[PDB]
Design a protein around this ligand. Structure first.
Ligand SMILES: *[C@@H]1C[C@@H](O)[C@@H](O)[C@@H](CO)O1
Ligand SMILES: [Mg+2]
Ligand SMILES: [Mg+2]
Ligand code: NA
Ligand code: NA
Ligand code: NA
Ligand code: NA
Ligand code: NA
Ligand code: NA
Lengths: 1019, 211
């Protein structure tokens, strides 16, 4: 077995040892030996990728690894791609757990059965690399700890899954063929700081590379940009550090480029200013470059310069060059406001994990770019790196596309009891400090990073305070935030709670979540408030999103938040027929697990939007609208840019029929206003409601959007002319036929049947074709949403959860008892009158009283009046349902759409005539629930049927019962015909969080008495 | 940190104590080379945290010190905040990097003179009366070392005390120092004599500067 010191020391069970022989952290290097190549950011011959086909063998523990593996390839090993997580190749199971550690909590110890990945690579090194200078290896991401060997000799050890580990291999390599051996441990003492709510995987999951640096080398460099009061003048200050022999002829030149133009330059020998009694840094120099009228960086306009750092002899010999993109911007908190370039930010943010449904936690350029384009297209301007430093390319892309970044240390100890057990313990300070300090050393030159975060969900400990102060000391250019221990501790510049509600206090002992409006004004409080997590987007969610944005806009110091979160953490599995399906917690034999709680995204794992995404896009719009008469007032919420790629399209329609349209160019200054006078509108021919819709279209393509991109919209009701004309009097009269079992009504080809034992319409005919597969009955329940269920930890139930209260009240079990069923014959109609009581174990929950009026024109008017017992939990819905025999291709409606919308999530929807394929009327949430509702609907058309009134509906091939009984979307089967759920009223979906009741009072069905009417006819 | 009995004796006899972390990197160039280096933060933190954990219940300890002559690095700032957080009962002081940095609650220079400025670059030793009223300065001033008692010395001692008594915010200081670091050697006849640097074959050495 591999030995002796390595297995003896057990460095992976010691928080005092987080590395051996690891090189110092630093900003991204490429060691260009040509300055023009550095400037253009073209590939460097001194930076080689070792990604591709490696050899891999799996072992149950490090003790099981054979000693021979160190010297030569194992025959039993396989050839696999690197980077990769070994769970994704099927070597063992990924584990989904939220809070509870995937291992027994016994710090610093891990299980003796410790899955061990043995990676190896035979590769070539050219003689030229070994004759001179330094050859290092860089592992961007290894999860969670590893020992490294080169050509059979031990090199070093590393921890922290989310930052690069670098080792000098100069003395280990030979010309020609070389062999790396990497023993990766799944569990280590590092795991105690990696308890993020996500899939627990392992392996070499980020890039591996070889870097060649000269012996005399740039070892570090920091770029700062400071400004005068109006940002018309800047000073770029670049501190550069060298390693190697100090020499008088050595120089650094820092040159600043705007495209092909060099805007500034400075050259100096080494030797910093005196700093104390012993002198200064002889191995450092600081260059100061004056920049007049700098082009400022923001998410709105991501202006970048190129800084080239040249290490050279005085007489002109370049030793090496390094470089970075530079964004001129100031981030500061002043008078309680987070300012960027002097202006208060409004953070339209989202948390984003590094997740791919096929490749797990391995990130690629295409996916990153896809994510960024989708975020910006949906009006996000900010991302939180939940909850670890990201793949290095992410920051480069955020610099270039323009997104504000919160860079977050890889520290989460959520499963500890209490949460701060390790973070208050000075014995864990060393391991914690490296996760903070090495992040700052790596990422401090990226303009996109505007805020540092100390980690996530690790309570508040003294270690947090120490590292807070370390950051403030080494980098005063960026605020520091941290949510743990109450979101407003001494370790944060920003009040940054998770799931604090807008108006409602949640006064938990020790760590209350105050109403965000209340929080700001607590005695002595002065800081800005930006939620690190809010609007939990789990399944059918984002109810109440508009309430946050209204408050964000009204309150200066409420400066936004980061939605939780971007993308469902579902993984692809394959069934017996090789068909892909989306899996969640427990689907890999992983146990214990927290099931679907890993799926909280605005988008599906494949980046298909959830309906909630449009709600986010709309509330995060950068243009605000008001209407007065026929004048539209457009207000810009851009801070820096003019509206130079925007036109306003307007449209007036009468119940879906276009009356007039037109367009006006937008010419709005940042924070400015523009008045748009609409032309005189034509008088409507018919009766009904006029609707004005405006939309902001971007005529030109950008780096992040296509030509014609819609960025903003708004609707208003204009004039309404109420119909005062009586329908044409029909000559025909429907006939009533009575039996003991049934009332049958006939009118031409049309027939209705009411069952006298049940009291419901049991059948209808058009021609002599039956229309119903299941009778039309009241429905007071929905297939529970993730929010209704309100579970965040599989073993924990909130008795106050809506699903728990509905179940215990017997809402799902309640049986309809007939009280009345009579028939009457009027002058031109047959009138059926019914009353029902729903009861559970002697308690009447609901009473439904109806009339059905069928006239000579063939229309059936259903009037429904419902009583709900005041002491039963408010019902999910008050409506009717039936299974129609007809399966049609299209659904046509006049109401809110086109996408799924609910009462507390309908601001993004527009009133119009919508026409979709039936399949679009179902939302494929991975965990199935009530879905696909559209609200404020006045007319619905499906095949031969038309329903009219003022209702909410959903329509699909899946019953509420099936949705309720099915755990995974791939297990759903289309039922015979089409299930129609038509509601007079429907409860909000909530989502302020998904583990407690979160539906606001105004969206609960608490009125006790409810009235609605539907007219059912043939089209 | 001293032998544990020292604090017990200071508690019982009555002496105010500045308990100081075992951190001095005077010989580094510049002096803060290690203390501004995040890789040395772990080793440094233990010298501070384990001192606090040991001595925090002693009433005689009234002030914590982050060490001596190690310039001023970001590691001092972090450890300053660590103490402030874990023990709000005692001020934290530290002289390195100019005696009035963000890592000290007390302006605590060594060998700053009463009336005479010593305007060294980066780390000046202002007149103590002047130091107090520099623009924005509010802290008390207590010299961590003053009146260097080397051989025939302590000239001008009365000047310090006159100033300490006149100025409220001049709250005294700690003389350097208590006892000559001389060692006993024996001559050919076995008679004892007082030895200093260099007398043991030790080289390089700084001779009598230990006394
Ligand atoms: C905040 C922390 C994050 O990692 C998630 O656990 C989220 C709930 O899904 O809460
Ligand atoms: Mg360890
Ligand atoms: Mg967590
Ligand atoms: Na605001
Ligand atoms: Na989650
Ligand atoms: Na425009
Ligand atoms: Na379900
Ligand atoms: Na005094
Ligand atoms: Na001395």
């Amino acid at each position: 077995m591999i030995d002796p010191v390595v297995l003896q020391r057990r460095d992976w069970e010691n928080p005092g040892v987080t590395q051996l022989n690891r090189l110092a952290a630093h900003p991204p290097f490429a060691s260009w030996r040509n300055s023009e190549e550095a400037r253009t950011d073209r590939p460097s011959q001194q930076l080689r990728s070792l990604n591709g086909e490696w050899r891999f063998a799996w072992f149950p523990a490090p003790e099981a690894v054979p000693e021979s593996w160190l010297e030569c390839d194992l025959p039993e090993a396989d050839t696999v791609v690197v980077p990769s997580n070994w769970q994704m190749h099927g070597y063992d199971a990924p584990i989904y757990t939220n809070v509870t550690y995937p291992i027994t909590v016994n710090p610093p110890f891990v299980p003796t059965e410790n899955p061990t990945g043995c990676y190896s690579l035979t590769f070539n090194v050219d003689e030229s690399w070994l004759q001179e200078g330094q050859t290092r290896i860089i592992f961007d991401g290894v999860n969670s700890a590893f020992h490294l060997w080169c050509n059979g000799r031990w090199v070093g050890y590393g921890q922290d899954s989310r930052l690069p580990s670098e080792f000098d291999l100069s003395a280990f390599l030979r010309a020609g063929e070389n062999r790396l051996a990497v023993m990766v441990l799944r569990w280590s003492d590092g795991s105690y700081l990696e308890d993020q709510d996500m899939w627990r995987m392992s392996g070499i999951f980020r890039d591996v590379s070889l870097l060649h640096k000269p012996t005399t080398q740039i070892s570090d460099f920091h770029v700062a940009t400071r400004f005068n009061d109006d940002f018309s003048r800047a000073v770029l200050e670049a501190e550069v550090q060298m390693c190697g022999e100090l020499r008088d002829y050595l120089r650094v030149t820092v040159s600043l480029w705007q495209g092909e133009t060099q805007v500034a330059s400075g050259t100096a020998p080494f030797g910093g200013e005196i700093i104390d009694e012993r002198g200064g840094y002889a191995d450092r120099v600081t260059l100061r470059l004056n920049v007049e009228n700098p082009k400022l960086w923001s998410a709105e306009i991501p202006n970048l310069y190129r800084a080239v750092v040249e290490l050279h002899t005085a007489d002109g010999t370049l030793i090496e060059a390094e470089a970075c993109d530079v964004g001129f911007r100031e981030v500061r908190i002043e008078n309680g406001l987070l300012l960027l370039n002097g202006k208060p930010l409004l953070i339209r943010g989202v948390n984003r994990h590094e997740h791919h449904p096929l490749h797990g936690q391995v990130m690629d350029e295409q996916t990153m770019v896809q994510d960024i384009l989708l975020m910006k297209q949906n009006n996000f301007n900010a991302v939180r790196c939940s909850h670890y430093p990201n793949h290095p390319l992410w920051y480069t892309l955020c610099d270039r596309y323009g997104l504000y970044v919160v860079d977050e240390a890889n520290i989460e100890t959520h499963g500890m009891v209490p949460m701060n057990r390790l973070t208050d313990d000075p014995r864990w300070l060393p391991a914690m400090s490296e996760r903070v300090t090495r992040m700052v050393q790596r990422d401090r030159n990226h303009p996109s990073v505007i805020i540092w975060s100390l980690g996530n969900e690790s309570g508040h400990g003294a270690n947090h305070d120490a590292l807070y102060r370390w950051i403030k000391s080494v980098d005063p250019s960026r605020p520091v935030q941290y949510e743990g221990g109450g979101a407003d501790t001494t370790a944060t510049d920003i009040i940054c709670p998770m799931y604090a509600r807008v108006d409602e206090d949640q006064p938990f002992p020790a760590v209350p979540k105050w109403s965000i409006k209340k929080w700001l004004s607590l005695p002595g409080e002065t800081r800005p408030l930006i939620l690190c997590e809010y609007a939990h987007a789990m399944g059918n969610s984002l109810g109440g999103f508009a309430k946050y944005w209204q408050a964000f806009r009204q309150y200066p110091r409420l400066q936004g938040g980061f939605v939780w979160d971007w993308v469902d953490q579902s993984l692809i599995k394959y069934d017996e027929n090789g068909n892909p399906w989306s899996a969640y917690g427990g689907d890999f034999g992983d146990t214990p697990n927290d099931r679907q709680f890993c799926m909280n995204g605005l988008v599906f794992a494949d980046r298909t939007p959830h309906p909630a995404l449009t709600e986010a896009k709309h509330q995060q719009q950068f243009f605000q609208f008001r209407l007065s008469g026929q004048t539209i007032e457009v207000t810009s919420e851009y801070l820096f840019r003019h509206s130079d790629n925007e036109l306003l399209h307007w449209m007036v329609a009468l119940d879906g029929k276009p009356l007039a349209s037109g367009e006006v160019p937008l010419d709005v200054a940042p924070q400015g206003k523009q008045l748009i006078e609409l032309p005189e509108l034509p008088q409507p021919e018919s009766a009904g409601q006029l609707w004005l819709t405006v939309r902001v279209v971007q005529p030109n393509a950008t780096a992040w959007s296509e030509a014609g991109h819609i960025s903003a919209w708004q609707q208003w009701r204009l004039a309404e002319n109420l119909s005062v004309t009586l329908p044409a009097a029909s000559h025909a009269i429907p006939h009533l036929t009575t039996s003991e079992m049934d009332f049958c009504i006939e009118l031409g080809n049309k027939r209705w049947q009411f069952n006298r034992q049940s009291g419901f319409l049991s059948q209808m005919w058009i021609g002599d074709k039956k229309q119903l597969l299941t009778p039309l009955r009241d429905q007071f329940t929905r297939a529970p949403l993730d929010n209704d269920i309100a579970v965040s930890e599989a073993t924990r139930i909130d008795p106050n959860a809506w699903v728990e209260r509905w179940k215990a009240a017997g809402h799902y079990q309640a049986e309809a008892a007939l009280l009345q069923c009579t028939a009457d014959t009027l002058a031109d109609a047959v009138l059926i009158t019914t009353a029902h009581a729903w009861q559970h174990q002697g308690k009447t929950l609901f009473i439904s009283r109806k009339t059905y009026r069928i006239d000579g024109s063939g229309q059936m008017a259903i009037t429904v009046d419902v009583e709900v017992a005041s002491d039963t939990p408010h019902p999910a819905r008050i409506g009717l349902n039936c299974q129609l025999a007809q399966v049609a291709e299209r659904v046509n409606w006049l109401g809110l759409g086109p996408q799924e919308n609910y009462p507390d999530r309908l601001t993004a929807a527009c009133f119009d005539r919508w026409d979709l394929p039936l399949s679009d009327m179902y939302t494929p949430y991975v965990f199935p629930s009530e879905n696909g509702l559209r609200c404020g609907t006045r007319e619905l058309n499906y095949g031969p049927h038309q329903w009219r009134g003022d209702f909410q509906f959903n329509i699909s091939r899946y019953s509420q019962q099936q949705l309720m009984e099915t755990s995974h979307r791939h297990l759903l089967h289309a039922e015979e015909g089409t299930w129609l759920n038509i509601d007079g009223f429907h409860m909000g979906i909530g989502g302020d969080d998904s583990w407690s009741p979160s539906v606001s009072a105004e969206f609960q069905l608490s009125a006790g008495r409810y009235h609605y009417q539907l007219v059912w006819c043939q089209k």
